[PDB]
Structures are given as C-alpha cells and as structure tokens.
Amino acid sequence: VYRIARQASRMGNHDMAKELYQSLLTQVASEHFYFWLNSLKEFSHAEQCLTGLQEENYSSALSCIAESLKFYHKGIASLTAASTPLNPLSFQCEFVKLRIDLLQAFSQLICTCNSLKTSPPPAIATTQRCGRISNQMKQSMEEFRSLASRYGDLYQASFDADSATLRNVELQQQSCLLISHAIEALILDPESASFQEYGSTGTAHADSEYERRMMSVYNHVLEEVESLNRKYTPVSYMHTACLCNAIIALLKVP
Amino acid sequence: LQFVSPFAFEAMQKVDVVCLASLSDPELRLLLPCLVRMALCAPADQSQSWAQDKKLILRLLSGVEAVNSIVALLSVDFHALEQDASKEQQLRHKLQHGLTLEFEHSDSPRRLRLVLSELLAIMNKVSESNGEFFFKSSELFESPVYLEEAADVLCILQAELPSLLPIVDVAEALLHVRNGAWFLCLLVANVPDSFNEVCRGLIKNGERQDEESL
Amino acid sequence: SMPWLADLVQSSEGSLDVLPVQCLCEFLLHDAAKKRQRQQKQRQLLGRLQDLLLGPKADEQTTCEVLDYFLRRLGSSQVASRVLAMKGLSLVLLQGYQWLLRDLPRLPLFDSVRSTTALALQQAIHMETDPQTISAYLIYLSQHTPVEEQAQHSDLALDVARLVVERSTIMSHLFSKLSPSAASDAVLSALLSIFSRYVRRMRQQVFLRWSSGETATMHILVVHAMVILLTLGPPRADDSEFQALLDIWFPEEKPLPTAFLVDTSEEALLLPDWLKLRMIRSEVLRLVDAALQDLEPQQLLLFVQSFGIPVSSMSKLLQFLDQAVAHDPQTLEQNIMDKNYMAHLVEVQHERQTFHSLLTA
Secondary structure, eight states: OHHHHHHHHHHTOHHHHHHHHHHHHHSOSOHHHHHHHHHHHHHHHHHHHHHSOOSSOHHHHHHHHHHHHHHHHHHHHHHHHHOOSSSOOOHHHHHHHHHHHHHHHHHHHHHHHHHTTSSOSSOSSOOOOOSHHHHHHHHHHHHHHHHHHHHHHHHHTTOSSOHHHHHHHHHHHHHHHHHHHHHHHHTSOSTTOOOSOOSOOOOOOOOSHHHHHHHHHHHHHHHHHHHTSSSSOSSOSHHHHHHHHHHHHHHHOO | OOOOOHHHHHHHHHTOHHHHHSOOHHHHHHHHHHHHHHHSSOOSOOOHHHHHHHHHHHHTTOSOTHHHHHHHHTOSOSHHHHHHHHHHHHHHHOOOSOHHHHHHSOOHHHHHHHHHHHHHHHHHHHHHHSSSOOOOOOHHHHOSSSOHHHHHHHHHHHHHOTTTSOHHHHHHHHHHSSSOHHHHHHHHHHSSTTHHHHHHHHHHSSOSSOTTOO | OHHHHHHHHTTOSTTSSOSSHHHHHHHHHHHOOHHHHHHHHHHHHHHHHHHHHTSTTOOHHHHHHHHHHHHHHHTSSSHHHHHHHHHHHHHHOOOTTHIIIIIGGGOTTHHHHHHHHHHHHHHHHTTOOOHHHHHHHHHHHHHHOOSSOHHHHHHHHHHHHHHHHHTHHHHHHHTOSSSOOHHHHHHHHHHHHHHHHHHHHHHOOEEEEOTTSOEEEEOHHHHHHHHHHHHTOOOSSOOHHHHHHHHHHSOTTSOOOEEEESSSOOOOOSSOHHHHHHHHHSSOHHHHHHHHSSOOHHHHHHHHTOOSOOHHHHHHHHHHHHHHHHHOHHHHHHTOSOHHHHHHHHHHHHTOOHHHHHHHO
16 A cells, blocks of 8 residues: 555555555554655645646635645655654655745745736836836746756755656756746846747657646747737736746646 | 734735625725725736726725825825935934824824834834844834824835835834834735745844743 | 933932922822832822821812822823823722712812813813823813803813814724724713803804804814714714704704804805715715705815715715716816726716716717
C-alpha cells in the first residue's frame, strides 16, 4: 500500500494517495516515519484541493489556493519534524517550500489582479504608470524572478537525482519564467518585447504526460500573450484576465 | 472596539458584491471608504461585467449619512496637500484649541493637514528612535468618541498618496501610536493587497529573541 | 500644571495640609508604610472636607471656594484634569454621575453654588468630549437651571444650540439608531423641555414672525438646533412637547413663521441647503413636505446625489424633478455635465422617468 500510494503521488491521483496515506498514518512504529507519512498525507490533501478548480472562476481560485496553502503548511511542519541527523531530508523540504512559495506567488498575483477591481484607476493626483497596481506587479516581477532563481538553485544543488526529477524541476522553473514573461509582456513595458515567440513551439520529446500537459499550457499562455500584445491600454482587464487564466491553467495540471 | 469580521475581509479579498450585500450595517460602515472610492471614481476596469457589479455596489451604498462626509473628504484639491506635505518633509529633516477640539471644529482640508503632519511626526520619530518602541500620546487617536472618521481619513490619505505614504512605513508608524491595531486592521482592510507585505515588514523591523519586551 | 505639582508635592512631606482650603483640595486632587500614612491623611482630609460641606461648620465661603476650584479645574483642556476633577467630586460627594443628580441637591447651600455650577457646566459644554458626561450635564441643567433670569436662560439656550450644531458627532453617537437607549431618550426629552420652556417664557440674530402675530429676536443657531431635535422624532417617554413644537413651527395647512434680518432689515433663508437636505433625511412627513417647496434644479441634483435618504423621499424628489423637467427642461439639461452619470443615478432612484427620458436623449 505504501508503494501504491507513492505511485499515485507520482502520477497525480492524489485522492487515493490521501486514503492510503491515512491507512499508513494509523500504522507504523517510529517517530520520523510517522511524521513523514503525515507530511505526505497533508501534501496529498492540498493537491486534491488544487484539483478542485473551475475555469473562469476566481473566487474558487482564492478559496482552493488558501486550502492548499494551509494543508501544505501542516505538511511542511510535519516534514520539519521528520528531519533526522542521520537522514537529513533536504530535497523534500526545499521542494515543498518552493511549491508553497509558488502557490503564494500565485495567490498574491490573483488578488493583485483583483486589485484593479478593488482600487481606483490611480488617485486624483494622476490625471506612464499610474496607480499602486504598477508597483504591485513590479513586486510580482521581483518575487517571480527570485523564485525562478531559487528553482535553479535547487536544480544545481542536487546532482544525485534522475532525469525525471530534474525535468520536473525544469517544469516548475519554466512555469515561473512563463508567468514572469507573461506579466512583463502585458503590463510592464510592452514596448521592448518585439519577439512574438520566434522559437519552436512543437515537436517535443514528451517523456511524460505531465510534461506534455505542462507544454500545452505553456504554448497556450504564450499564444494568449502574442495575441494580446500591443492593442490595448497598459493596465487593461484582458491583461488581468490573461494572468487569471494563466494561473488557472498552471494549477489545473496537478 | 469592534474589529472587522473575517467574512468581510474575505469578501474584500473575493471582490464579489453578493457577499458584501449580506453584511450588517456597522460592518458596512467600517468597510465604507474603500467602497465609496470604488463607487465615485473613474473606472479602473472597463468590463461589461464590472458595469452591473459597480451598479450593485452603489445600490447597497445608501444608509449611513456619514458617507456624504467622506465624500467631502474626496472633494479637495490634493496637489496643494502634497506640496505642503513635501515642504513639511524637508522642514522636518532640517494651536490654541486641543487636538480633539481642532479635530471637530474643522472642515476637510485642515483635517487632512493635521493628520498628514502628525503622520510625518510619527514617521520621522521612527527614523530618529532607531529600535526603541517609543511612546507618543497623540490625543486624536486615544479619543474614544472620535475614532471611526479618524480611520476613514486614514484610509483616504492611504488611498490618495501612493509614494508619500508608503504602506509598511505607515503600518509600523501606527503600530507605535496608541490603540491602533484596529487602525492597522482598517488600513489592511481597505486596500486588500496589504496583508502579506505588512506581515513581511512587521516581521523584519522588530525585535528578534524576546517577545516579553514592551 | 500637572508635572511640576507632581514633583513638588511628592518632594514636600511636611506641607501636606497647608492652611488655605484651596491647597487642601489641591493636595486632595494630587492624592486622587508611606502609602498607608498617605491614605490615612487623605481619609482625614476627606472627613474634614465633608464636615466643611455637609457638617454643622459648613459656611458659604469655603464651600464656594471648593466647588469653584473643582469647576475651574474641570475647565482645563486636558481630559485627565477633568478625570481628576470627576474623581475628587465623586469622592467628596447614570450611576457614576449620581453625585451630581442626587448628592449635590442635598447640600444645605445649594442655590447660589448651583447657579454657579450651572454656569460652569454650560462653559464645559463648550469643551466636553465624552457623550455620557454631556448627557449627565444636560440632565442636571434641565433639572437645576435658574429659570427666573432671562440672560442666564438665553445663554443656556445658546450653549445648547452651539452644542447641537458644532458638535453634531456627539449627538449622532447619542442618537445611534442601532442602540436607542433610555438615557438618550431622557436627554432628548429634557432638551425638548428646555426649548419648550424657553419658548413658553418668550412668547408670553434674526427677527422671526409667526403666522399668529408673535415676534422674536432670536439666534438662527437655536432654530437649527431645535429643528434638528425635531428631526430626531418623538421621544418614547413624552409626546406632547414634541407635537407642540411641531405644530407651532410646522403647522398644518398654514404658512411657516418667516425670517427677517435684525441689522439690515432683509428676509433671510431660515432653511439652508444642508438643513433642507437633513429635513429630507428625516422620517417626519411634515418636515419633508415643508422642505419640498422652493427647490432649485441644481439643489435637486445636489440632494439626489446624496445617500442615506428614505425611500419615499427619493420617490417624491423624482416626481418633483419630473415637474421641473416639465417646467423648464433646457436649463436643467444645461446643468447636466455627464448624461450617463445622472441617468444611472435616476435608474438607481427607480428601484430603491421623464427626467430619465431627458437624460437618455
């Protein structure tokens, strides 16, 4: 049942992972193995919460993101308790921590997209960036670029993983670059983009189904970015809707 | 001292009108100034959905006459206020009536002037103290009868002046003043994108080891 | 005068009493092994003051000096000074304010010092910030104002008028519609009784003339205060006085008492735009019907743009705006600066016509 549970966690069926992790949690005869299984249970719970999404619905996005963060934080507390001097679990804690940081970057981004509907156009003083939303999405640049750098640092510091784990880390880093480019092409200086994705967007190796769905999401978001390039006002609401749909598309693929 | 309900702060997070509609009167009055800036301002959003969403926002805005009062708060020329605040800023770097008495017997612009001046005083006293949790007995914040329009005008200057009132600085500054955790509650309630970076700021610029300090 | 007193009294152990009585009350207000001796001396001083006010040795001079000192310490701008004067007056003599209502009238020399206390509390009404303290002060004034003096009663009426007008936040808190208290109802009834007895005295600056022929040289702020008290509605305890004032100043099918200027002899507007807006805000139908007459289209747009108004008031304002459209449409159209905004505003007034038809065109 432990092998079945970890196979389900590998593929993406996190509900059966939840149930078998419950079964393991009642079981087992040591401290840190118990904490490890509790952490895996909490991760499966947050990932089922992430599977419970609906397209073009930002309310459910905020709700399910908050549930995913709280279950991941119970899980990362369990992982920190599970760490041992003999087996210093370092990949797991960093991967979970950067996953938490990615979902909070997504949460700040989605509520920042909500801020245009929750604040003025700027102020009575402003009448080429006007409003607090420009500073907020500049902070989004800082957070997402730092997060991509931290994904790169996790990639470089492992050296002991296989091709699939490294490629998954590359998928997460490419998601961070995707959101960063999508924002800095829509709102923050459209003028010097001038690219329209002059590289290949097809004929991939596709070594896993998760890779293929990640690449399809990446290509769709880049298509939306190319189409919505320099037609509309710099703030816009098609821009915020594009970010919202991008975040939903990233969080749909589990 | 009544703190805003968590459901109201979610409804501000959720940016939906149907949960704002099913909300009690003092909660609406406490959440007001953001909502009236959402109502009487140029449309930041141009969507056809935000049309009837804004229509329903202004639909529930009636009641509480003090709305009109803070409409006066959004009725002044603000450029003179920001030049005056900047001139006071370089002045600091180089009143016959009491605080409550001047606070009541006044119109909007000099109320704005006094509140921005004392925010400048609390901010540069933070810059002067450098670590020690200093005590200031600013009367208009102790002021148990006059608190809600003070939170209103704090929200107004917070949503007017983006650069001259930075978020984390004003947040810690009103942490140092008297009983204004509810002031910070209002300041993070009115602008929904404030809670996580105010959490960041309060985590850095404080004590490290001993929570038993003042 | 707090900190130098604090570091002078505490540094002078041998002079805790001092022969003048004013210094005795000063040290009592400062006080409000060593701590036990200080408490015993404070108790002895309290007993001496109680003998000097309620005992057989109570003369007029010492009582007047003590209470005048307490009242002049109440007048200090700092709230802590008024708190200390509160503590001293409560220790020597609305459960927390029962000394002013019950213990103070039991004094043997109550008349002259009661008039002095009434004048001092009228001066404190200029400055007090606590609503319940102002409520107790108004109750004591309504129960113990010297009615015989015309100048003192007119000063009382003017002070209550200034309290209502310039400190409307205090009465707004005291007339919170969420929690209507019985003490607030009693305070409203007391203020209505004060205005009613002022009017009963006078009827038996602006020149006001009634439809019955009576004349007045009053202050317009008193009129503002009493018409705001009229908008507060009938009190739950008493109803005859409120209906009497409503019938006198807003009589049924009769013209209103007109206003006039004392100095330059001109007609003055008794109901300004903000006052008429608050009349429309009121739930009394007679006040709204009185405010309906003589409304400009610009004033109509100003009144409609406001919020917090009852539903039937928007309805009748909508038919009055339709009547204004039917009278002069071109001037009202020229007063329109954004057709979409007022068209939408009228659409809001609908579900809470001719004017909307003009706006859509």
